[PDB]
Short mmCIF file of all heavy atoms in Angstrom, two decimals:
data_model
loop_
_atom_site.label_atom_id
_atom_site.label_comp_id
_atom_site.label_asym_id
_atom_site.label_seq_id
_atom_site.Cartn_x
_atom_site.Cartn_y
_atom_site.Cartn_z
N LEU A 1 0.84 -1.24 0.00
CA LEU A 1 -0.01 0.00 -0.01
C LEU A 1 0.86 1.27 -0.01
O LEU A 1 0.31 2.31 -0.38
CB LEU A 1 -0.93 0.06 1.23
CG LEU A 1 -2.00 -1.04 1.34
CD1 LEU A 1 -2.63 -1.01 2.71
CD2 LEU A 1 -3.05 -0.89 0.26
N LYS A 2 2.09 1.23 0.48
CA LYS A 2 2.74 2.53 0.89
C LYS A 2 3.09 3.40 -0.32
O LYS A 2 3.17 4.65 -0.16
CB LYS A 2 3.94 2.32 1.79
CG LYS A 2 5.08 1.51 1.22
CD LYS A 2 6.38 1.98 1.78
CE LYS A 2 7.59 1.47 1.00
NZ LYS A 2 7.96 2.39 -0.10
N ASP A 3 3.31 2.83 -1.51
CA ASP A 3 3.54 3.64 -2.74
C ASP A 3 2.37 4.61 -2.93
O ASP A 3 2.59 5.70 -3.48
CB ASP A 3 3.75 2.75 -3.97
CG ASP A 3 2.52 1.94 -4.38
OD1 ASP A 3 1.65 1.68 -3.49
OD2 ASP A 3 2.40 1.59 -5.57
N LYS A 4 1.17 4.24 -2.50
CA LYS A 4 -0.04 5.10 -2.66
C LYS A 4 -0.15 6.11 -1.51
O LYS A 4 -1.02 6.98 -1.58
CB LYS A 4 -1.29 4.21 -2.71
CG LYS A 4 -1.69 3.75 -4.10
CD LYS A 4 -2.33 4.86 -4.92
CE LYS A 4 -2.85 4.40 -6.26
NZ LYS A 4 -3.28 3.00 -6.21
N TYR A 5 0.70 6.04 -0.49
CA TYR A 5 0.58 6.92 0.71
C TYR A 5 0.76 8.38 0.36
O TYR A 5 0.03 9.22 0.88
CB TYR A 5 1.53 6.51 1.84
CG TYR A 5 1.21 5.20 2.50
CD1 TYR A 5 2.09 4.65 3.42
CD2 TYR A 5 0.04 4.50 2.24
CE1 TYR A 5 1.82 3.46 4.05
CE2 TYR A 5 -0.23 3.30 2.85
CZ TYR A 5 0.67 2.78 3.78
OH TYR A 5 0.41 1.58 4.41
N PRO A 6 1.78 8.79 -0.46
CA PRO A 6 1.93 10.21 -0.78
C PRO A 6 0.70 10.79 -1.46
O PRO A 6 0.32 11.91 -1.14
CB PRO A 6 3.12 10.23 -1.73
CG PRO A 6 3.90 8.98 -1.38
CD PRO A 6 2.84 7.96 -1.04
N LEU A 7 0.10 10.06 -2.43
CA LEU A 7 -1.13 10.50 -3.12
C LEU A 7 -2.26 10.66 -2.09
O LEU A 7 -2.97 11.71 -2.07
CB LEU A 7 -1.52 9.54 -4.21
CG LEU A 7 -2.85 9.84 -4.92
CD1 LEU A 7 -2.75 11.12 -5.75
CD2 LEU A 7 -3.26 8.67 -5.81
N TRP A 8 -2.44 9.61 -1.29
CA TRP A 8 -3.51 9.56 -0.25
C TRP A 8 -3.30 10.67 0.77
O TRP A 8 -4.34 11.27 1.17
CB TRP A 8 -3.60 8.18 0.37
CG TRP A 8 -4.12 7.15 -0.58
CD1 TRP A 8 -4.77 7.40 -1.76
CD2 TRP A 8 -4.09 5.73 -0.45
NE1 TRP A 8 -5.12 6.24 -2.36
CE2 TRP A 8 -4.73 5.18 -1.56
CE3 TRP A 8 -3.58 4.86 0.54
CZ2 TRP A 8 -4.89 3.82 -1.76
CZ3 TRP A 8 -3.72 3.50 0.36
CH2 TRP A 8 -4.35 2.99 -0.79
N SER A 9 -2.06 10.96 1.13
CA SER A 9 -1.72 12.04 2.08
C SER A 9 -2.17 13.35 1.49
O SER A 9 -2.81 14.15 2.20
CB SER A 9 -0.23 12.07 2.38
OG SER A 9 0.19 10.85 3.02
N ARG A 10 -1.82 13.59 0.22
CA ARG A 10 -2.15 14.86 -0.50
C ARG A 10 -3.66 14.98 -0.65
O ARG A 10 -4.17 16.09 -0.43
CB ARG A 10 -1.41 14.90 -1.83
CG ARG A 10 -0.15 15.80 -1.84
CD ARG A 10 1.03 15.25 -2.59
NE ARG A 10 0.69 14.59 -3.84
CZ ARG A 10 1.38 13.59 -4.40
NH1 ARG A 10 2.48 13.13 -3.84
NH2 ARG A 10 0.96 13.04 -5.54
N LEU A 11 -4.35 13.89 -1.03
CA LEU A 11 -5.81 13.95 -1.30
C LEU A 11 -6.62 14.08 0.01
O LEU A 11 -7.66 14.78 -0.04
CB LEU A 11 -6.30 12.71 -2.05
CG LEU A 11 -5.89 12.63 -3.53
CD1 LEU A 11 -6.47 11.40 -4.15
CD2 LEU A 11 -6.30 13.90 -4.27
N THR A 12 -6.22 13.42 1.07
CA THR A 12 -6.95 13.44 2.38
C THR A 12 -6.50 14.62 3.24
O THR A 12 -7.29 15.07 4.08
CB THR A 12 -6.79 12.13 3.17
OG1 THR A 12 -5.41 12.03 3.59
CG2 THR A 12 -7.21 10.93 2.37
N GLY A 13 -5.26 15.08 3.05
CA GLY A 13 -4.69 16.15 3.89
C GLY A 13 -4.20 15.62 5.23
O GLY A 13 -3.96 16.42 6.13
N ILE A 14 -4.09 14.29 5.36
CA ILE A 14 -3.50 13.66 6.58
C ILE A 14 -2.23 12.97 6.16
O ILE A 14 -2.29 12.15 5.21
CB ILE A 14 -4.46 12.66 7.27
CG1 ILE A 14 -5.70 13.34 7.77
CG2 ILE A 14 -3.72 11.91 8.36
CD1 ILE A 14 -6.93 13.01 6.99
N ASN A 15 -1.12 13.23 6.84
CA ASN A 15 0.14 12.52 6.54
C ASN A 15 -0.05 11.07 6.91
O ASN A 15 -0.43 10.75 8.04
CB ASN A 15 1.36 13.15 7.23
CG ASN A 15 1.83 14.38 6.49
OD1 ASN A 15 1.50 14.60 5.32
ND2 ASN A 15 2.58 15.20 7.17
N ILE A 16 0.20 10.20 5.91
CA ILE A 16 0.13 8.73 6.04
C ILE A 16 1.56 8.22 5.81
O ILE A 16 2.00 8.19 4.63
CB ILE A 16 -0.86 8.12 5.04
CG1 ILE A 16 -2.25 8.75 5.15
CG2 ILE A 16 -0.93 6.61 5.21
CD1 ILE A 16 -3.10 8.54 3.92
N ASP A 17 2.22 7.78 6.85
CA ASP A 17 3.63 7.34 6.73
C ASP A 17 3.66 5.82 6.86
O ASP A 17 4.69 5.20 6.49
CB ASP A 17 4.52 8.05 7.77
CG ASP A 17 4.73 9.52 7.46
OD1 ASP A 17 5.08 9.85 6.29
OD2 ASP A 17 4.52 10.34 8.40
N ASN A 18 2.54 5.23 7.33
CA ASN A 18 2.47 3.78 7.65
C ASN A 18 1.02 3.32 7.74
O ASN A 18 0.11 4.18 7.78
CB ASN A 18 3.21 3.44 8.94
CG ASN A 18 2.72 4.24 10.13
OD1 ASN A 18 1.61 3.97 10.60
ND2 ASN A 18 3.47 5.18 10.63
N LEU A 19 0.85 2.02 7.84
CA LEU A 19 -0.46 1.33 7.94
C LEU A 19 -1.26 1.82 9.17
O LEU A 19 -2.52 1.87 9.08
CB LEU A 19 -0.23 -0.19 8.03
CG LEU A 19 -1.47 -1.07 7.91
CD1 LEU A 19 -2.29 -0.71 6.67
CD2 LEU A 19 -1.07 -2.53 7.86
N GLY A 20 -0.59 2.11 10.27
CA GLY A 20 -1.19 2.69 11.47
C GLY A 20 -1.87 4.01 11.18
O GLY A 20 -3.00 4.25 11.63
N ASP A 21 -1.19 4.86 10.40
CA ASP A 21 -1.76 6.15 9.92
C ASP A 21 -2.97 5.87 9.01
O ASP A 21 -3.96 6.51 9.16
CB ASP A 21 -0.72 6.99 9.19
CG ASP A 21 0.44 7.44 10.09
OD1 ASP A 21 0.24 7.42 11.34
OD2 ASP A 21 1.50 7.77 9.57
N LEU A 22 -2.79 4.94 8.08
CA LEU A 22 -3.82 4.65 7.04
C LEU A 22 -5.10 4.23 7.77
O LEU A 22 -6.19 4.64 7.35
CB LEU A 22 -3.34 3.57 6.08
CG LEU A 22 -4.26 3.34 4.87
CD1 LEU A 22 -4.38 4.62 4.06
CD2 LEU A 22 -3.75 2.19 4.04
N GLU A 23 -4.96 3.52 8.87
CA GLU A 23 -6.13 3.00 9.61
C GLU A 23 -7.01 4.18 10.04
O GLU A 23 -8.23 4.14 9.81
CB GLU A 23 -5.67 2.18 10.80
CG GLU A 23 -6.80 1.55 11.55
CD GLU A 23 -6.49 1.22 13.01
OE1 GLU A 23 -5.33 1.46 13.42
OE2 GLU A 23 -7.39 0.76 13.71
N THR A 24 -6.45 5.22 10.63
CA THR A 24 -7.28 6.35 11.15
C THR A 24 -8.02 6.99 9.96
O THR A 24 -9.18 7.38 10.10
CB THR A 24 -6.42 7.35 11.95
OG1 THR A 24 -5.50 7.98 11.11
CG2 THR A 24 -5.67 6.64 13.04
N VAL A 25 -7.31 7.12 8.83
CA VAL A 25 -7.90 7.71 7.58
C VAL A 25 -9.06 6.82 7.14
O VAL A 25 -10.11 7.36 6.76
CB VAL A 25 -6.82 7.85 6.51
CG1 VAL A 25 -7.41 8.27 5.18
CG2 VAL A 25 -5.72 8.80 6.95
N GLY A 26 -8.90 5.51 7.19
CA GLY A 26 -9.95 4.56 6.75
C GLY A 26 -11.16 4.66 7.64
O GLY A 26 -12.35 4.57 7.12
N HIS A 27 -10.95 4.80 8.95
CA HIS A 27 -12.10 4.86 9.90
C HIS A 27 -12.87 6.14 9.58
O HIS A 27 -14.12 6.10 9.62
CB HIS A 27 -11.64 4.86 11.37
CG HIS A 27 -11.01 3.59 11.80
ND1 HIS A 27 -11.50 2.36 11.44
CD2 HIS A 27 -9.93 3.37 12.59
CE1 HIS A 27 -10.76 1.41 11.96
NE2 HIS A 27 -9.77 2.00 12.67
N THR A 28 -12.17 7.20 9.26
CA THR A 28 -12.83 8.49 8.92
C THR A 28 -13.58 8.34 7.62
O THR A 28 -14.74 8.80 7.52
CB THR A 28 -11.83 9.63 8.88
OG1 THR A 28 -11.25 9.71 10.18
CG2 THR A 28 -12.48 10.95 8.52
N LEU A 29 -12.97 7.75 6.61
CA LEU A 29 -13.60 7.63 5.26
C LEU A 29 -14.90 6.85 5.37
O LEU A 29 -15.90 7.19 4.73
CB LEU A 29 -12.66 6.96 4.28
CG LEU A 29 -11.42 7.73 3.87
CD1 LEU A 29 -10.56 6.95 2.88
CD2 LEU A 29 -11.80 9.07 3.27
N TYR A 30 -14.86 5.84 6.22
CA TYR A 30 -16.03 4.95 6.47
C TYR A 30 -17.21 5.74 7.06
O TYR A 30 -18.35 5.52 6.66
CB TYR A 30 -15.61 3.82 7.40
CG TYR A 30 -16.70 2.83 7.66
CD1 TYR A 30 -17.14 1.96 6.68
CD2 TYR A 30 -17.29 2.75 8.92
CE1 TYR A 30 -18.13 1.05 6.92
CE2 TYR A 30 -18.28 1.83 9.17
CZ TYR A 30 -18.70 0.98 8.18
OH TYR A 30 -19.68 0.07 8.43
N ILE A 31 -16.93 6.59 8.06
CA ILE A 31 -17.98 7.36 8.78
C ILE A 31 -18.60 8.31 7.75
O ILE A 31 -19.78 8.58 7.75
CB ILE A 31 -17.40 8.07 10.00
CG1 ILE A 31 -16.97 7.02 11.04
CG2 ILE A 31 -18.40 9.07 10.59
CD1 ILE A 31 -16.30 7.60 12.28
N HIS A 32 -17.72 8.81 6.90
CA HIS A 32 -18.00 9.64 5.71
C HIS A 32 -18.94 8.91 4.77
O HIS A 32 -19.92 9.53 4.34
CB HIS A 32 -16.65 10.05 5.12
CG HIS A 32 -16.21 11.42 5.47
ND1 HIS A 32 -16.22 11.90 6.75
CD2 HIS A 32 -15.66 12.40 4.72
CE1 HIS A 32 -15.76 13.13 6.75
NE2 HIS A 32 -15.40 13.45 5.54
N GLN A 33 -18.71 7.62 4.50
CA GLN A 33 -19.66 6.82 3.68
C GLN A 33 -21.02 6.61 4.36
O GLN A 33 -22.05 6.79 3.71
CB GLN A 33 -19.10 5.43 3.42
CG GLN A 33 -18.20 5.34 2.21
CD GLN A 33 -17.84 3.94 1.86
OE1 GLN A 33 -18.17 2.98 2.59
NE2 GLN A 33 -17.15 3.79 0.75
N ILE A 34 -21.01 6.26 5.65
CA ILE A 34 -22.23 5.96 6.41
C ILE A 34 -23.18 7.15 6.29
O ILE A 34 -24.40 6.93 6.19
CB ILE A 34 -21.97 5.72 7.91
CG1 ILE A 34 -21.13 4.46 8.15
CG2 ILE A 34 -23.28 5.65 8.71
CD1 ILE A 34 -20.84 4.27 9.62
N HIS A 35 -22.63 8.34 6.45
CA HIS A 35 -23.40 9.59 6.51
C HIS A 35 -23.48 10.29 5.16
O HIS A 35 -24.02 11.41 5.14
CB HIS A 35 -22.78 10.51 7.54
CG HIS A 35 -23.01 10.02 8.94
ND1 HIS A 35 -22.03 9.31 9.60
CD2 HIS A 35 -24.07 10.11 9.75
CE1 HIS A 35 -22.51 8.99 10.80
NE2 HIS A 35 -23.77 9.47 10.90
N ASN A 36 -22.91 9.68 4.13
CA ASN A 36 -22.89 10.21 2.75
C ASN A 36 -22.40 11.65 2.79
O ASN A 36 -22.97 12.51 2.10
CB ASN A 36 -24.27 10.15 2.11
CG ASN A 36 -24.79 8.75 1.96
OD1 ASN A 36 -25.84 8.40 2.52
ND2 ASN A 36 -24.04 7.91 1.25
N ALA A 37 -21.39 11.92 3.62
CA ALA A 37 -20.67 13.21 3.61
C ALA A 37 -19.74 13.21 2.45
O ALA A 37 -19.33 12.11 2.02
CB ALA A 37 -19.94 13.38 4.92
N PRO A 38 -19.39 14.38 1.86
CA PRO A 38 -18.48 14.38 0.71
C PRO A 38 -17.14 13.74 1.04
O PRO A 38 -16.63 13.80 2.17
CB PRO A 38 -18.33 15.89 0.36
CG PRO A 38 -18.78 16.63 1.61
CD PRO A 38 -19.83 15.74 2.26
N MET A 39 -16.62 13.08 0.02
CA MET A 39 -15.28 12.42 0.08
C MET A 39 -14.26 13.39 -0.48
O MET A 39 -14.64 14.34 -1.13
CB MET A 39 -15.32 11.13 -0.73
CG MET A 39 -16.42 10.17 -0.27
SD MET A 39 -16.11 9.26 1.32
CE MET A 39 -14.35 9.49 1.50
N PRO A 40 -12.95 13.21 -0.26
CA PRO A 40 -11.97 14.09 -0.90
C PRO A 40 -12.12 13.98 -2.44
O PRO A 40 -12.20 12.87 -2.96
CB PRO A 40 -10.62 13.57 -0.43
CG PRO A 40 -10.93 12.87 0.85
CD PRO A 40 -12.30 12.24 0.65
N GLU A 41 -12.22 15.11 -3.11
CA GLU A 41 -12.39 15.11 -4.57
C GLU A 41 -11.16 14.47 -5.20
O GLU A 41 -10.02 14.79 -4.75
CB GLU A 41 -12.63 16.53 -5.10
CG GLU A 41 -13.27 16.48 -6.47
CD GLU A 41 -13.55 17.87 -7.02
OE1 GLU A 41 -12.57 18.54 -7.37
OE2 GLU A 41 -14.73 18.26 -7.07
N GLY A 42 -11.38 13.57 -6.16
CA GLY A 42 -10.30 12.93 -6.93
C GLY A 42 -9.84 11.64 -6.30
O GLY A 42 -9.16 10.88 -6.96
N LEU A 43 -10.18 11.36 -5.02
CA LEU A 43 -9.82 10.06 -4.38
C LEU A 43 -10.73 8.98 -4.95
O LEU A 43 -11.99 9.08 -4.86
CB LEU A 43 -9.96 10.17 -2.86
CG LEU A 43 -9.56 8.96 -2.00
CD1 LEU A 43 -8.13 8.53 -2.19
CD2 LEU A 43 -9.79 9.32 -0.55
N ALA A 44 -10.13 7.99 -5.60
CA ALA A 44 -10.83 6.95 -6.39
C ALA A 44 -11.70 6.09 -5.49
O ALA A 44 -11.30 5.85 -4.36
CB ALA A 44 -9.83 6.15 -7.17
N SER A 45 -12.83 5.61 -6.02
CA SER A 45 -13.76 4.71 -5.31
C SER A 45 -13.01 3.40 -4.94
O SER A 45 -13.18 2.91 -3.83
CB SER A 45 -14.99 4.41 -6.13
OG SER A 45 -14.68 3.59 -7.22
#
């Protein structure tokens, strides 16, 4: 996954240096899906 971390960092605005970081971003994106809140523009489905 980590090759995608710089793109994901830039698109989410959260620094992702490792899987531990990615987890917090994932939990947020999920709550974002449940409530159909907007996702970061350009972040692929």
Side-chain angles (χ1 to χ4, degrees):
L1 296 169
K2 62 148 193 89
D3 66 334
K4 271 284 186 31
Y5 290 172
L7 174 67
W8 290 345
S9 299
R10 258 141 39 210
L11 287 183
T12 67
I14 297 109
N15 282 340
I16 306 160
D17 290 310
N18 57 71
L19 190 51
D21 295 341
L22 188 61
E23 184 205 357
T24 67
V25 173
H27 293 319
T28 300
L29 289 181
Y30 183 70
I31 293 177
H32 259 49
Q33 274 189 353
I34 294 178
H35 288 98
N36 298 121
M39 304 286 342
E41 200 179 72
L43 183 59
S45 72

